Design a protein around this ligand. Structure first.
Ligand SMILES: [Ca+2]
Ligand SMILES: [Ca+2]
Length: 291
């Protein structure tokens, strides 16, 4: 029965971002060694969500067990039974819940790999059920809404004043790398005065202290992880440079907000990053998510 199992959502980050593919796994019995579930998933920092329904054979006290590297969360019947979302070598965790023979219960298992070894196994036991891998005959995949690939770039609001007040249009900018060079991006302005807000998500290649850099002809603010790390909103200098630092982990998304105001100069703004292993560059569209 091709259809039996749970639906597995496979992401290339460890926080259920960078969605790659869905597939129906007949059971949760994976040992990926130091590798990945599929050639389309990169080594390290990945996550999997399995959802559907489990059907016990007996009306009894079930024990659910997870053996994972790294972390896990297990819901059965909307109860969070196991909450061990952490870095761990292969480790069993378990909890009990009372179920009724032949009833179909919601099950959701969230898993992630950080580094080194990766595995995920879901088992059950009861008075009459000898401890096994939960088999495909007792598991029904969810259907309903597939996950959506998010779009690269950031959601930009363009304003017809310098104070982020009069909103003219929204689009997705591939990156924050603009030399507008007197042809303002917004029409019908007074005194060349306009402003922009980019919102979305960013992820990094490396775990370490990043430095974000703005080069700008007007005022800038930058938030990363909802921390204000650049604040030069009054600036007028041509290609004025600001920097600010934040510690980030590879393999997960962080909020990003960038605000720009032009005070009538020919407009310019670039957002760069650097770190001990990241050489200074314009932050690339492939690390920016529009959400
Ligand atoms: Ca990854
Ligand atoms: Ca691991």
């Amino acid at each position: 029965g091709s259809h039996m199992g749970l639906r597995g959502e496979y992401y290339n980050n460890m926080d259920f971002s960078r969605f790659q593919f869905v597939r129906i796994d007949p059971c949760i019995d994976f040992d990926w060694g130091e590798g990945t579930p599929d050639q389309s998933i990169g080594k390290d920092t990945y996550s999997v969500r399995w959802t559907g329904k489990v059907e016990p054979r007996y009306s009894e006290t079930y024990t659910f067990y997870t053996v994972t590297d790294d972390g896990v969360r297990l819901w059965v019947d909307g109860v969070l039974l196991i909450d061990k979302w952490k870095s761990q070598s292969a480790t069993e965790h378990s909890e009990q819940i009372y179920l009724e023979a032949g009833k179909k219960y919601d099950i959701k298992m969230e898993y992630y790999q950080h580094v080194r070894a990766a595995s995920a196994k879901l088992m059950w036991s009861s008075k009459s059920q000898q401890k096994e891998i939960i088999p495909s005959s007792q598991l029904y995949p969810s259907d309903g809404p597939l996950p959506q690939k998010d779009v690269n770039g950031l959601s930009a609001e363009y304003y017809g004043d310098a104070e982020l007040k009069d909103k003219r249009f929204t689009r997705i900018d591939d990156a924050i790398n603009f030399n507008w060079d007197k042809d303002f991006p917004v029409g019908e302005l007074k005194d060349g005065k306009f402003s922009v807000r980019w919102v979305g998500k960013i992820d990094t290649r490396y775990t370490e202290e990043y430095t974000f850099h703005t080069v700008a002809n007007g005022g800038v603010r930058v938030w990363i992880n909802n921390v204000l790390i650049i604040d030069n909103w009054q600036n007028q200098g041509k290609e004025a440079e600001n920097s600010g630092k934040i510690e980030l982990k590879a393999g997960r998304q962080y909020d990003i907000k960038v605000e720009y105001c032009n005070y009538g100069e020919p407009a310019f703004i670039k957002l760069l990053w650097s770190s001990q292993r990241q050489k200074k560059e314009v932050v690339p569209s492939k690390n920016l998510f529009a959400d």
